[PDB]
Amino acid sequence: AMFQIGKMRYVSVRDFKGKVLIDIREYWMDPEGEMKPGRKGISLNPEQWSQLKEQISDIDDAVRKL
Amino acid sequence: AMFQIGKMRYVSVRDFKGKVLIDIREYWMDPEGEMKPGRKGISLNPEQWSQLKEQISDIDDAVRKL
């Protein structure tokens, strides 16, 4: 499943060979008009994704102060 | 500011040329014990971070389905 988070930037949630991965990444468009995953991305497992969610208040506090 | 989300994986928030960036990335440890940013990460501006958070309920439904 794909969820857009900006221009050319998507979260992908898939079962990759038996393990669920939450992938946050930049994409390019190739000359054939297809969207292709770029190198600037990170693949998280469900535990790491849950830790990101637990850190949202603290991340948001830093965003509003910096 | 750095917020750990797994072994060697952190969300950073910083001000960069008067712009805030929320960076989700893998880190290495150098020979002096310092964490240094790896290639596998993505840098989001506040608007994209906001859009990722807006998509969390749907991302989570997909993680549970898969």
DSSP string over A5-28: EETTEEEEEEEETTEEEEEEEEEE
Q: Quick check: helix, strand or coil at residue A58?
A: helix
Q: Quick check: helix, strand or coil at residue B58?
A: helix
**Between B9, B47, B58, which is nearest A3 by CB?**
B58
Q: Which CATH number fits domain B1-66: 2.40.420.20, 2.30.110.10, 3.40.50.9100, 2.30.31.10?
A: 2.30.31.10
Q: Where are the domains of chain B?
A: 1-66
Residue A15's closest CA among B66, B60, B56, B59? B66
Resolution in A: 1.7
Residue B32, min C-alpha distance to chain A (Å): 25
Q: Quick check: helix, strand or coil at residue B29?
A: strand
Interface of A with B in 4-63 (CB under 8 A): 4-6, 9, 11, 13-15, 20, 22, 24-26, 39-49, 51-53, 55-56, 58-59, 62-63
Round to whole Å and give the CA distance between B54 and B37: 27
Strand partners, B36: B28
Residue keyed to tokens 């637990």:
A54
> What are phi and psi for residue A18, nearest 5 degrees?
95, -10
